[PDB]
Amino acid sequence: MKTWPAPTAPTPVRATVTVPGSKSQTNRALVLAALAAAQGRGASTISGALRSRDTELMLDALQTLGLRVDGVGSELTVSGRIEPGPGARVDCGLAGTVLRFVPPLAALGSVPVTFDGDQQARGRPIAPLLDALRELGVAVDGTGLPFRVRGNGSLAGGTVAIDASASSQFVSGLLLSAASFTDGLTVQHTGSSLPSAPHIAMTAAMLRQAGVDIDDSTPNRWQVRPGPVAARRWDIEPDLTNAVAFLSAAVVSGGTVRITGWPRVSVQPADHILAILRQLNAVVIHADSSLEVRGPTGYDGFDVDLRAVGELTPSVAALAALASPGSVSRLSGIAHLRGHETDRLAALSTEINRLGGTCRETPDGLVITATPLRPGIWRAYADHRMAMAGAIIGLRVAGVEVDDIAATTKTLPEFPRLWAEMVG
């Protein structure tokens, strides 16, 4: 496959970028629309939905369970029932949200639904969630992919303790269907280290928008009351995590990038993002329903806790590599990233060091010393965020090529075009 040459920015980037819908939100909207339809409440529509490999894997998963998902552009309509056919098999691909959000949903069906995935997907944690489902009265064959959920059209529900240290999606996946369990559900995360708090809060918030009663007033504990899931119209926000790759362009080039339709109040961690940009002395302003960032003329090393926003680590590692010569940066809170798409700490370390950089993995992150970089081939490891991180680096390093820029289709199929239009 041909490499993709990352275009350089010998001068301040200046652009207005529209990024498409949020993956996290879109795939939550699809699961909740599914539950409503399967409850008999009717069809739901998702407006401004992300169309990408991860959301296509989700609706296909949903269509495999018996539901009907229509729409050619960003408007998706969900209808039908959970009624899987014989030999039903969900392809989880590399979408963690399918792997983690759909086995609870399939338990409401009445047939064995098999879950399978990419060889790379088979490295992703899932065993805790499967054990949870067993505790909650579901027959599940297998402890990893491929596994079978043997549904008897009913999930007892109740109370369960889970160690979700490896992935917040184990809590989110349980919470999304719990309204449909007879007894509803009480989930207790045991121990500590619960990554990605904003994404469990995103689940809680969208549940409440669907009229589900969820109690999260005590940390590490969630209580959902059995009840109707409303059929409604869902309005999808631009993906703020993808927005940051584009905004990083303003930051490393000292230029100016605006993201259109940035939400003033949002179910995504916008505050965490903006605060991290301002750490690098970027100037961030809200203007005409769009977000504008002005990068500084230079910046030094930073320490940044990413525990709550781990999926920013590749773009922020790229920023750390492009800091003033000699700058030392520390990214922390992100031990759980060894369990992602790919182990992102090893991968980022490998690729940055290949460009002559200095990136050291630590027990919970990366320490990165900015040193001059050289041309090279930046490998994506089939990971959309790794691909975009190489793009950020090539803005400031001539001769950088990403092996597989198509990895970006996971959440942003149009990245090459978008990125080319922003840098030109």
Ligand SMILES: C=C(O[C@@H]1CC(C(=O)O)=C[C@@H](OP(=O)(O)O)[C@H]1O)C(=O)O
């Ligand atoms: C891994 C990615 O996104 C994830 C989207 C996600 C979800 O709830 O939507 C939850 C978080 O999961 P975890 O607790 O396993 O880190 C994300 O990090 C990514 O896109 O890079």
